[PDB]
Design a binder for this molecule. Structure first.
Ligand SMILES: O=P(O)(O)O[C@H]1[C@H](OP(=O)(O)O)[C@@H](OP(=O)(O)O)[C@H](OP(=O)(O)O)[C@@H](OP(=O)(O)O)[C@H]1OP(=O)(O)O
Length: 133
């Protein structure tokens, strides 16, 4: 169930890097994000996103941001929606009431709180097929 996963965003370039400070940006590697991205160990739909075997912790921001600063919390539970056609959607599982689509930019400054809807960046994430089906 666990394998070197990555979160590629079809927005010009390669995306798969996370800074301890709590920020994700562009980068190129062999399906390995910062070291090893793990997305699995949950029920159908709900997924646990782990960045780096031991060190980083992918967590969502209450306002609208995605960080990997090691901080165990429900905010780490996300919903993975793969539509097969080389694209998937992610939403804050715990915050179903505010299912705001994620999506960052090569600059690093993600865009979830500003206004997610317009632009394929909001709905055009291509990760690794490895998931807890
Ligand atoms: O209003 P913002 O917070 O500054 O975000 C916008 C917005 O991106 P999202 O609404 O998907 O978050 C634009 O999308 P559109 O509404 O125009 O479809 C996008 O334009 P692109 O579709 O070309 O990415 C633009 O990016 P850019 O400034 O490179 O044109 C980006 O601004 P930021 O990249 O600064 O977040």
């Amino acid at each position: 169930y666990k394998k070197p996963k990555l979160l590629y965003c079809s927005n010009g370039g390669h995306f798969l890097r996370i800074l301890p400070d709590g920020t994700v940006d562009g980068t190129r590697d062999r399906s390995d994000q910062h070291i090893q991205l793990q997305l699995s160990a949950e029920s159908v739909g709900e997924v646990y996103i782990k960045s780096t075997e031991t060190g980083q912790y992918l967590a969502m921001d209450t306002d609208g941001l995605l960080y990997g600063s090691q901080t165990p919390n429900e905010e780490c539970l996300f919903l993975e929606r793969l539509e097969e056609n080389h694209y998937n959607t992610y939403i804050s599982k715990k915050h179903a009431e505010k299912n705001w689509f994620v999506g960052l930019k090569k600059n690093g400054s993600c865009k979830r709180g500003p206004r997610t809807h317009y632009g394929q960046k909001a709905i055009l994430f291509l990760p690794l097929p490895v998931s807890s089906d």
